Structure 1
Amino acid sequence: KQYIISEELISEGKWVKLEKTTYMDPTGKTRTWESVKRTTRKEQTADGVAVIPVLQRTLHYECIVLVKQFRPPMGGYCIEFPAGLIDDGETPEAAALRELEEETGYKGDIAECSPAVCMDPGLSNCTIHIVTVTINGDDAENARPKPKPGDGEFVEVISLPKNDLLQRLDALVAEEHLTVDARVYSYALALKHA
């Protein structure tokens, strides 16, 4: 029933733009919406990837590998899945494994790859693939993992046991001002609810 009629540029930065979207509502009436888009999406199936990295080690409980970084939009530190935009020509899988190694030092193995999923669909068209990766933490490659941050990236790695993830996130939030990401919280909630 509903569809886009037009998209008028309001303001375009280097990285993000704002658009006035005109669409057809299901009663047959024309309405508008203010929409955010990135300027960086070419032929990628999504803007970015986020990596669910499952660290597996003999005689250890499985951990979820997370990263903490300062996020200027939020004006503070956030705890997130490792993530980055997909480079032109790059596969989501390749991007996931590259970002995971850049941000954490770990060399993972692909487990699964989601379809393109929407970040905040009332606000923006931004999409990611959520890529599940296992890390063989008994491999010597993953013994002394050193992040390779790119220019203007400072990332801290936080590995938390899967079997206690939500409580461990709560204890981090109780101890300093930081924000957990909604996807991480959602995943930690489901682990509890299961």
Structure 2
Amino acid sequence: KQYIISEELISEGKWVKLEKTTYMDPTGKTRTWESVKRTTRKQTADGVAVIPVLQRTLHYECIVLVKQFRPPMGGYCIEFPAGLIDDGETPEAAALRELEEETGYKGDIAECSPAVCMDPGLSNCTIHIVTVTINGDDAENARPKPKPGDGEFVEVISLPKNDLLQRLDALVAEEHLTVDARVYSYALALKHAN
């Protein structure tokens, strides 16, 4: 009942563009919406985010998260490891790669979502969420070697899965970080289960 009629380019950056989308509203009326798009999509989705479940025997299972300065936010954020999928890269392979680069961990694919939207009111950006397990008792993950690209500066924060929401709430209160909405949603559901 609703659909895209046309798109007008407003402003094209190197990495992001602003567009104005004309669409047919369900009453038969023509409307416009200002939308953002990345200039980099080819792929299934722009990117992957990894849910990295760090399993060590006789320890609480941890969720592995990353802290980085985000220029749009003007501040430090706590997030699942994530980045863009390379052209010709599968989402699974992008997930293990990004996980290793950002955290140094070598993980195993558990499951992979369909493409999901990040902020569909604002952008067309999508990701696959890839749940990965990390055998923290394997020698490859003993002294994990984080291999950032040029211009990445990433701190690793592992938090117990069974108290994740209370732990994140602590970090916000006392470290003045912003927690990512996907991380917070995951943590909430861990509490709301049953």
Smaller-chain TM-score range? over 0.9
Show CA shifts across 1:117-152 (max 9, x none).
000000000000000000000100000002101100
Q: How does 1:74-93 map to 2 (within 5 A)?
A: 74-93=73-92
Q: What is the Cα deviation at residue 82 of structure 1? A: 0.1
Partner of 2:186 in structure 1? 187
Partner of 2:126 in structure 1? 127
TM-score, scaled to structure 2: 0.99
Q: What is the Cα deviation at residue 157 of structure 1? A: 0.2
Q: How does 1:17-96 map to 2 (within 5 A)?
A: 17-42=17-42, 44-96=43-95
Report the 3-state secondary structure (helix = DSSP H, G, I; strand = E; otherwise coil) of the residue aligned with 2:72: helix
Q: What is the Cα deviation at residue 94 of structure 1? A: 0.3
Q: Does 1:99 align with 2:133?
A: no
Show CA shifts across 1:13-61 (max 9, x none).
000000010000000110000000000001x000000000000011111
Q: What is the Cα deviation at residue 178 of structure 1? A: 0.9
- Give % identity: 100
Partner of 1:2 in structure 2? 2
Q: What is the Cα deviation at residue 185 of structure 1? A: 0.2
Q: What is the Cα deviation at residue 175 of structure 1? A: 1.1
2: CA distance between counterparts of 1:159 and 1:105? Answer: 13
Report the 3-state secondary structure (helix = DSSP H, G, I; strand = E; otherwise coil) of the residue aligned with 2:119: coil
| Residue segments in structure 2 that go unaligned for 5+ positions in a row | none
Q: What is the Cα deviation at residue 174 of structure 1? A: 1.2
| Residue segments in structure 1 that go unaligned for 5+ positions in a row | none
TM-score, scaled to structure 1: 0.99
1: CA distance between counterparts of 2:161 and 2:69? Answer: 24
Compute the RMSD of aligned alpha carbons.
0.4
2: CA distance between counterparts of 1:146 and 1:139? Answer: 14
1: CA distance between counterparts of 2:26 and 2:173? Answer: 45
Runs of 4+ aligned structure 1 residues displaced above 6 Å come to none
Report the 3-state secondary structure (helix = DSSP H, G, I; strand = E; otherwise coil) of the residue aligned with 2:58: coil
